[PDB]
Design a protein around this ligand. Sequence first.
Ligand code: 2CF
Ligand code: MG
Ligand code: MG
Ligand code: MG
Length: 530
Amino acid sequence: VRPVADFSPSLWGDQFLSFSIKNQVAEKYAKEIEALKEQTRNMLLATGMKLADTLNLIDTIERLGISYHFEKEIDDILDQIYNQNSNCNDLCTSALQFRLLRQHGFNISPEIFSKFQDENGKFKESLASDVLGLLNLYEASHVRTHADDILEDALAFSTIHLESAAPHLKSPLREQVTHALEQCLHKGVPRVETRFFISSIYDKEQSKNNVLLRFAKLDFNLLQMLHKQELAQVSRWWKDLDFVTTLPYARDRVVECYFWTLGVYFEPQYSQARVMLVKTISMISIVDDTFDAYGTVKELEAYTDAIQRWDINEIDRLPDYMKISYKAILDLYKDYEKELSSAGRSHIVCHAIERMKEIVRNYNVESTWFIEGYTPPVSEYLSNALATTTYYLLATTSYLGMKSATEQDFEWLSKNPKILEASVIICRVIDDTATYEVEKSRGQIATGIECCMRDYGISTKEAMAKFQNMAETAWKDINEGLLRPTPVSTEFLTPILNLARIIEVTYIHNHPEKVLKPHIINLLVDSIKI
Ligand SMILES: CC(C)=CCC/C(C)=C/CC/C(C)=C(/F)COP(=O)(O)OP(=O)(O)O
Ligand SMILES: [Mg+2]
Ligand SMILES: [Mg+2]
Ligand SMILES: [Mg+2]
């Protein structure tokens, strides 16, 4: 006897299946972008700029989503600003300097906020009528670490006054403030925040710089072309696996999986990485569904064993349908090895394989606890449930397509560094707070909130409050993990940071398909009108 399928069909049909990129328009865009890019570079390399104007320029280029073209230029400017350690006198410039520096790994001291607080460490209420300062303070309060307790009340302070000011602000500032209160910049998905800023804010800004705006629109639309080409290629690959018919119990969400990948990295250089990553996200959702709503204890046990052994000769020990999954998985990793041969990086593939074996083991433990009706103490729950987030696997997989990723980087990641663990915790805690009721109605007595309630002997509310504090602790750890000197290149930390952002954005409110729908349309269907 099998469970009631239910689930939901892909509401996207096949609108993404084929996309012909007319080079005529792409060539034109590429060509003007080159020119706008240099005009912009020259804007950055201009001498005699005041601090406030320099920070505003960088902040604008970053929000417009084109800063990836100026990594070096922006780095040198912030480095110089860091070392000049000048201390501006207004909240607005000080909070922006603090945020941009910290987001880039420069450990600027939070003491720059002292002058804005009374004698007992609390922000002067007289600042309540400085909206731009409050907005930058608000954004800055989200990048703090455990060593920034002088900013412990910054979030509440700026939030209360911004909510009060918002209704009477001019546009588009009002829209920017309202958006910020719903979604801070530091914790949002990069392309999503960029799309909103370009068309809802900057495009409607009186003082907007026409060069940057045009640059931002053409770039966003040119990259969108690449993304649509990637998604078509992926939809075709997914269509040719035809799990939609052979494994009718599994979800069909290749589009939502691709979106996830787009959140990890959107830049053109990560094209191969994205295609490789989406295949694993899609493949793991199938493995998950198999353990979630179909496979029997006996089948799952054999399924886990086969995975641990990892040999196409083991397929005979599994029931018909699992032979489909199992072979696909083996082939996928064989394909990765093949794709990396050219560059001579096929040896790193095993790291991803180990994470796959690991999550399968934990999936099996998960169902065992379900069958038994076991409610483990939080400590034990987390030891197993962290991996079932899929995040150790996704993070490891995100490195496969990155040309610069070396063995040393994978070794660092294999030891579960603090930044990765923080990202994994955020995902676990957010999902557990959001999926508590549902899973509970299925008698899944081993859900995080339940374990926490029984363990500490507290109410569901108190349990969720404790889990929120864990996510908060985790964000401070991620922020701290980005500070120089970093254990590996920042290029390898960003995907981990982005994974935490994606889950936060997906569960912004306690589905997730209709939460992602509008983002997918904005990033992959509709271009920004020039
Ligand atoms: C922390 C976790 C596990 C999920 C957070 C939300 C989502 C959608 C994450 C994407 C990861 C994938 C590929 C899943 F299959 C996730 O699996 P499931 O969302 O169908 O649900 P359960 O594994 O928690 O039963
Ligand atoms: Mg599951
Ligand atoms: Mg599931
Ligand atoms: Mg859940």
